[PDB]
């Protein structure tokens, strides 16, 4: 049962959602909804990025979740998703407009479990899972690193014995004169102090482990004619594959409703409390682990943490970083409550007053221990940072609804007034100069150094007046008209309020009398919708020219703190220096709402006695007057960024969902759910400065206007130079040599320069598809979900340090194993460029070499279960007893062009592990 019946509505089967056993219900529906992209890195929390109907705006694209009628934008990883009864996604502007003013990026409706009338039930779910690392990046060992360094040295013509890294090479020349390596030897200690012995260390294995996930839920519901109630307690814990990273969550949900005065009066409430404690991996931990060479031992001779010495590259120990970061635990309390009252003066009139509250508390204590890893140290810096953050959102809604059933005409008229208020604040203290260096002793009162205080606050408000009219004729013709008047505190008084209309039409062809003989065609409906929605998801202080007294107490990297504090006297400090103000941004009083117009056409069909159902959708989204933050022209200096309505986004998309469920003669019930979606995005208008800096694409070389959002311009790599004759024949370029990347001459001017660039990267897949198979046979239920993406290109940063030697910010870094298969006179059948120590050809530039085919098809979740027969369960008095074993991310298929692994996450972010889970469900 769709709650709109005339728009693009996707209904998610919650039974399959809980089968995957994911903490975040959103992450479970990664590819089960057409026109919906869910990206998850794989960290222990269920945090993920959601994109509905592609990218339709230049500001934040987070969709507006709605739970029990309360809107929000926070992630669902911090909420208990196991007590969800129904999930509805509103991807159409006309359908989602009536649910709030923040429906620009789509609306997701989440309904919590409620006690069913006339029965009382309980459900206890237990789940234990083991997560194993699968995308183990292959890196060179000590011998492989030495061989690669020797190959680079001999390719560059330098003496390999002058590496000054403890490597002694016994090598010679073959008959053809190509250098050949016979053997290598290493000094026992990398330094002259004999404190860092050489060893073969698997850093990826050292920093990874086998995580343990435990989930325990207990829900009870009780219904009655005078009311109903529901109480759920949930516990979740996930240990990440990366060491010293974990996330656990307690959840308590209480829902109830009461009917008084012979069903005239109703009072209901839905409340939930969550407590999530998490230790997160440090930024770029995978990058640090990959960069550090395997020759560095984990522990030194004296038992201290190992580190680079002498000429080894300046890379911190990933294991020591994880050990020091294990105490950076943050606690998050989530408060999601709602109380509603409903009154019915007569049969057709309803008045609902609803109050919703969302209170978020975050407390963190970050520690900075003194470390000395060889030549890497922080000069004995020890510090504590105690941070507190508060978020408070409250919403009040007044709804008046009238329904009439006169003749064959059904008419619903609803009006509503909504008020939203959000207030955010944060403050933190910083202390230094500790002695014991333990979490127990590291408190700000126990410090003896410089102390700093930080603190900020902000907020906004929303006012909405909405009206919805629905007309139904003969249960065959449906018309919907809605109007919205929305205002926000982020705009000036002149442009505070804006009006948004939406219209929807629907015709049930199967209800027409001219096809009564079509018994096979059970149902057929054609619907269209044209709607307008408003977007204002911008900075709260957007229309004000912001001047702030940035003294310079905030930590900055590279010294570009831009603080305002100068020793005008010239006493080299010693006190409070004079301060001032700096401009953060230039205000603009002409900013207004961003108008997104959505046109949707849908065909819903159901054939063979409601067995073969499906829907086909075509949508066109056009966003104009987009509030974009343009940067300064260059001479305007600091604070030149300002918000302006100079954007234009276009999205043309197709979606197709199909489902076929049927039994079998011998007792097998098979249900197949197929889904496919495609979309094309385009940028039509953009400010000149934004197109020049290339923040939305183009890399600052060409304007992204007229091209897909996120498209990147780069060079074209036409293979590599296999001979000097090839170098001479090709157009002249800087750094051209044998074994180097050959760049195509686009304009045929005879020289390779900055103008030989074209559009090479397009982050738009050809189509994303999903397939869910459910089989029931003799109390055995098997679930199998496949998700695939075809026609998508990906930029691989791992390739930059796996296909080249010394292609990073620093040299002598550890590289990938496939680097051993580089081009050489001995091995001419290779496409990887020859190893070198100097990047004369400048191979770090953006080109088609780093663009790979991201197409993949992976088994997201497979589950085999056994249900106890009813007679045994009744003998044990149990209503239901089930067991199941599942595998998540067990198998995947990638393209041959993709040289790396894990096409979903081809970057240095958190890896995606394989989960093996065993679970039980009891229905006492």
């Amino acid at each position: 049962r769709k709650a709109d019946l005339t728009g693009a509505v996707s209904v998610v089967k919650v039974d399959e959602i809980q089968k995957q056993g994911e903490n975040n219900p959103v992450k479970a529906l990664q590819g089960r909804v057409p026109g919906m992209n869910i990206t998850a890195d794989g960290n222990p929390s269920g945090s993920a990025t959601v994109r509905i109907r592609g990218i339709g705006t230049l500001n934040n694209n987070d969709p507006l979740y709605i739970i029990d009628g309360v809107p929000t934008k926070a992630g669902m990883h911090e909420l208990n998703g196991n007590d969800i009864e129904s999930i509805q996604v509103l991807k159409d502007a006309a359908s989602a407009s009536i649910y709030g003013s923040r429906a620009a990026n789509g609306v997701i409706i989440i309904t919590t479990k409620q006690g069913k009338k006339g029965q009382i039930k309980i459900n206890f779910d237990a789940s234990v899972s083991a997560s194993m690392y699968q995308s183990k990046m292959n890196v060179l060992n000590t011998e492989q690193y030495g061989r690669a360094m020797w190959q680079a040295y001999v390719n560059d013509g330098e003496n390999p014995n002058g590496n000054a890294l403890g490597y002694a090479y016994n090598w010679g020349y073959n008959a053809d004169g190509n250098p050949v390596l016979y053997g290598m030897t290493l000094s026992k200690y990398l330094d002259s102090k004999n404190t860092m012995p050489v060893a073969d260390t698997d850093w990826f294995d050292e920093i990874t482990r086998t995580g343990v996930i435990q989930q325990y839920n207990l829900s009870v519901s009780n219904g009655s004619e005078k009311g109903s109630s529901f109480f759920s307690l949930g516990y979740y814990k996930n240990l990440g594959v990366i060491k010293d990273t974990d996330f656990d969550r307690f959840s308590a949900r209480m829902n109830s409703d009461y009917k008084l005065i012979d069903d005239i009066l109703t009072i209901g409430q839905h409340f939930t409390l969550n407590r999530t404690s998490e230790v997160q991996a440090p930024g770029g931990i995978i990058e640090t682990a990959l960069d550090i060479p395997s020759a560095i031992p984990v522990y030194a001779s004296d038992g201290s943490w190992g580190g680079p010495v002498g000429g080894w590259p300046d890379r911190r120990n990933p294991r020591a970083v994880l050990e020091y970061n294990k105490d950076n635990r943050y606690t998050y309390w989530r408060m999601f409550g709602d109380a509603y009252v409903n009154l019915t003066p007569f049969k057709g009139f309803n008045l609902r007053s609803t109050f919703g509250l969302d209170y978020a508390n975050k407390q963190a204590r970050y520690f900075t221990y003194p470390y000395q890893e060889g030549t890497q140290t922080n000069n004995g810096k020890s510090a504590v940072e105690a941070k507190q953050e508060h978020w408070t959102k409250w919403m009040w809604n007044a709804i008046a609804t009238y329904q009439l059933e006169v003749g064959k005409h059904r008419g619903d008229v609803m009006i509503g007034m909504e008020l939203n208020r959000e207030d955010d604040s944060h403050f933190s203290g910083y202390k230094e100069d500790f002695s014991i260096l333990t979490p127990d002793y590291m408190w700000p009162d126990a410090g003896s150094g410089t102390a700093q205080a930080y603190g900020a606050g902000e907020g906004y408000s929303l006012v909405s007046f909405f009206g919805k009219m629905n007309y139904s004729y003969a249960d065959r013709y449906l018309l919907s008209l809605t109007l919205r008047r929305d205002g926000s505190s982020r705009f000036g008084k002149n442009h505070r309020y804006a009006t948004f209309p939406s219209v929807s039409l629907g015709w049930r062809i199967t209800q027409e009398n001219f096809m009564k003989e079509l018994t096979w065609l059970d149902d057929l409906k054609l619907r269209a919708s044209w709607g307008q929605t408003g977007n204002q998801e911008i900075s709260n202080l957007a229309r004000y020219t912001i001047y702030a007294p940035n003294y310079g107490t905030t930590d900055s990297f590279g010294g570009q703190s831009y603080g305002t504090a100068y020793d005008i006297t010239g006493s080299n400090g010693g006190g409070v220096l004079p301060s001032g103000f700096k401009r953060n941004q230039i205000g603009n009083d002409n900013i207004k709402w961003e108008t997104t117009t959505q046109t949707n056409v849908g065909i819903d069909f159901s054939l063979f006695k409601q067995s073969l159902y499906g829907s086909l959708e075509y949508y066109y989204k056009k966003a104009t007057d987009i509030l974009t933050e343009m940067a300064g022209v260059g001479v305007l200096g600091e604070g030149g960024s300002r918000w302006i309505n100079s954007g234009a986004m276009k999205n043309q998309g197709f979606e197709f969902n199909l489902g076929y469920r049927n039994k079998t003669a011998f007792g097998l019930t098979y249900d197949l759910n197929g889904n496919i979606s495609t979309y094309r995005n385009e940028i039509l208008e953009l400010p000149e400065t934004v197109a020049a800096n290339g923040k939305f694409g183009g890399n600052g070389v060409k304007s992204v206007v007229g091209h897909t959002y996120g498209a990147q311009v780069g060079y074209i790599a036409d293979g590599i130079f296999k001979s000097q004759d090839e170098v001479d024949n090709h157009a002249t370029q800087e750094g051209a040599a044998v074994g180097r990347i050959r760049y195509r001459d686009i304009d045929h001017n005879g020289v390779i320069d900055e103008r030989d660039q074209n559009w090479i990267y397009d982050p738009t897949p050809s189509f994303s598809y999903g397939l869910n198979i459910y089989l029931e046979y003799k109390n055995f239920d098997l679930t199998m979900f496949w998700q695939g993406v075809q026609g998508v290109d990906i930029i691989s940063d791992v390739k930059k340090k796996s296909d080249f030697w010394s292609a990073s910010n620093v040299g002598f870094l550890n590289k990938g194993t496939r680097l051993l298969n580089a081009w050489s006179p001995t091995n001419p059948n290779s496409d990887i460029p020859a190893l070198t120590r100097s990047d004369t050809n400048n191979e770090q530039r953006v080109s088609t070499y780093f663009v790979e085919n991201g197409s993949f098809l992976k088994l997201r979740n497979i589950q085999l279960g056994y249900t106890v027969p009813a007679v045994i369960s009744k003998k044990m008095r149990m209503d239901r007893l089930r067991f199941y074993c599942s595998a998540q991310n067990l198998l995947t298929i990638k393209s041959k062009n993709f040289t790396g692994e894990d096409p979903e996450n081809p970057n240095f972010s958190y890896p995606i592990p394989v989960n093996i889970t065993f679970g039980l469900n009891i229905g006492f």
């Binding site: 002498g310 000429g311 030549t375 890497q376 008020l419 700093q452 603190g455 606050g457 907020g459 906004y460 505190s489 505070r496 020219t545 912001i546 001047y547 702030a548 007294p549 003294y551 310079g552 107490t553 905030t554 930590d555 590279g558 010294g559 570009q560 703190s561 305002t564 504090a565 100068y566 020793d567 005008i568 006297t569 010239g570 080299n572 400090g573 220096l577 301060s579 001032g580 103000f581 401009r583 260059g634 001479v635 305007l636 200096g637 600091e638 030149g640 400065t689 020049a692 800096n693 290339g694 600052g700 900055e754 910010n809 040299g811 002598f812 120590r837 100097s838 004369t840 400048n842 770090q844």
Partner: protein, 551 residues
């Protein structure tokens, strides 16, 4: 309906309140703070990152890839207009200009009687804006002259770099210095605020740069203006400098030591402070990359062997004008100018006059494993035990960066007198002799080097006699080279003199033998002596910015 108006911005000041008279002084401080907090490791206002193009120093780091754009700039090959460093320095200097313009706009709306020091603050703001404009002009020939504080932001889109010619742009830059000199006080109680003498000296520098005309589409010198030289001589008079109590220090190293900050020779400097209540102090984060490998990381701005050979002198105490670079300097057999040990830290010698740290040719001192040599600059570095050095993820100190030195004033006066060619050449010779005599007596910390490492110090002033114009010019050029080593002024001087191409090519040819980094190095006649206008700026301002010649 006050629901949408109850909440107000928190912790900030609106744009209509920043013009109030009680904040203008604070804004003044802002115009100074950008010169100490608005510089990055890869973009410093000393312009040492872009000075690697000259023959004074290489680029440090692990290798060529460490700062690839800077390596391309150093080799003058493979330079693209879409370079992040060029746009970064452009944006930072224009941010400084914007702060100065905001301070000027706030100051211009004040009554003279209510604010007696209005003229002095306005002069200081104009001096800061002119300094930023001069640095942009040195970096880029074609720059936008933003000298209108009462200009709306939208009109900034109509600004162009071709509104004024080269001479007109130089005059516009010099007008601010003229106003500052006419308005700044003779003596300033606060060392941070520039004085009248500093404004006069910097105006003389601007007029000297204006004298070497670069008219025409190309970047070739088209003559020497006599009026500009006369203006330089007028504004470099010793009476003006003596009015402010500025003179040469008794020791050279006193100009680069924390114990003697804000000295007589420190005409104007950026005040860097420590323990000042910020996160790590207003340290010189632009020199963070220049710290040696003995501190753990960085090791950039490594002086070249060419400068060390230049510091070598003959038995008569004069620099070797033709045979200095034929052979490497020998500590035991070759006479050396004492200024070398105050500028370049050679291996086998104490680091920053510290006996406990001796520079060695190993991996503990060079991060490039000998690719970029083993020499370490000492002017911008400090003693590890100074207690003025702090670790804020980059080793930076509170040593002041002296923008204008009295030796620079004397050498500019000598240059003006020599290029005038209307007599008074003996005055320039006397100034050079005074500089050489100051160098000779700068041995208060390196006197034991004679009895500890066999170092022979032999420098003598030039004899007072008639000298030809070319001989005096060559002697002045050599004095400038041996005086401002690692001070980030060699490339600008070469560009101004018009002989940058030949000198850079000869340096590349000479150093290619001992350095492979210059194997493919090449300098274009009219392309590589000026940084190109960033492509992002040109794209943003369509039909307004014109790229430099040769790009």
């Amino acid at each position: 309906d006050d629901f949408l108006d109850r909440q107000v911005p928190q912790g900030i000041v609106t744009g209509d309140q920043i013009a109030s008279p009680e904040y203008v002084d604070n804004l003044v401080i802002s115009a100074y703070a950008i010169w100490a907090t608005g510089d990055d490791i890869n973009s410093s206002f000393s312009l040492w990152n872009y000075d690697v193009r000259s023959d004074d120093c290489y680029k440090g780091g692990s290798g060529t890839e460490d700062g690839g754009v800077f390596n391309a700039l150093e080799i003058s090959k493979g330079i693209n207009t879409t370079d992040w460093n060029i746009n970064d320095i452009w944006k930072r200097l224009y941010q400084c200009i914007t702060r100065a313009n905001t301070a000027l706009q706030s100051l211009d709306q004040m009554d003279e009687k209510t604010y007696p020091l209005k003229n002095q603050r306005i002069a200081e703001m104009r001096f800061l804006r002119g300094h930023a404009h001069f640095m942009l002009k040195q970096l880029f020939k074609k720059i936008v002259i933003v000298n209108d504080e009462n200009m709306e932001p939208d009109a900034y889109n109509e600004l162009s770099n071709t509104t004024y010619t080269n001479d007109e742009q130089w005059q516009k830059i010099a007008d601010d210095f003229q106003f500052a000199y006419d308005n700044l006080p003779e003596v300033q109680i606060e060392k941070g605020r520039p004085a009248q003498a500093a404004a006069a000296a910097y105006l003389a520098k601007t007029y000297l740069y204006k004298a070497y005309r670069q008219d025409g589409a190309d970047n070739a010198l088209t003559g020497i203006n006599e009026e500009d030289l006369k203006q330089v001589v007028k504004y470099t008079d010793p009476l003006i400098m003596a009015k402010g109590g500025y003179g040469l220090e008794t020791d050279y190293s006193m100009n680069f030591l924390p114990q003697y900050e804000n000295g007589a020779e420190s005409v104007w400097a950026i005040q860097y402070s420590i323990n000042d209540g910020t996160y790590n102090g207003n340290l010189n984060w632009g020199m963070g990359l220049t710290t040696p490998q003995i501190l753990g990381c960085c090791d950039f701005h490594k002086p070249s062997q060419n400068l060390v050979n230049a510091f070598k002198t003959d038995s008569q105490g004069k620099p070797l004008f033709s045979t200095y670079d034929n052979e490497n300097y020998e500590v035991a057999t070759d006479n050396v100018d004492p200024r070398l040990f105050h500028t370049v830290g050679m291996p086998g010698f104490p680091y920053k006059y510290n006996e406990g740290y001796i520079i060695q040719k190993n991996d503990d001192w060079s991060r490039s494993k000998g690719l970029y040599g083993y020499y370490v600059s000492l002017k911008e570095n400090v003693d590890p035990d100074c207690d003025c050095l702090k670790k804020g993820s980059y080793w930076a100190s509170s040593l002041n960066h002296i923008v204008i030195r009295y030796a620079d004033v004397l050498l500019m006066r000598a240059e003006a007198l020599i290029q005038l060619n209307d007599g008074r050449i003996t005055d320039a010779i006397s100034l050079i002799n005074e500089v050489r005599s100051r160098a000779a007596g700068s041995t208060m910390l390196i006197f034991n080097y004679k009895e500890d490492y066999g170092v022979n110090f032999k420098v003598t002033p030039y004899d007072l006699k008639a000298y030809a114009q070319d001989e005096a010019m060559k002697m002045l050029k050599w004095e400038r080279r041996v005086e401002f080593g690692m001070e980030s002024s060699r490339f600008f001087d070469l560009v101004r003199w018009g002989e940058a191409k030949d000198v850079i090519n000869a340096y590349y040819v000479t150093e290619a033998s001992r350095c492979s980094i210059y194997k493919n190095a090449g300098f274009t006649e009219n392309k590589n002596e000026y940084l190109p206008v960033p492509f992002e700026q040109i794209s943003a301002s369509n039909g307004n910015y014109t790229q430099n010649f040769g790009w």
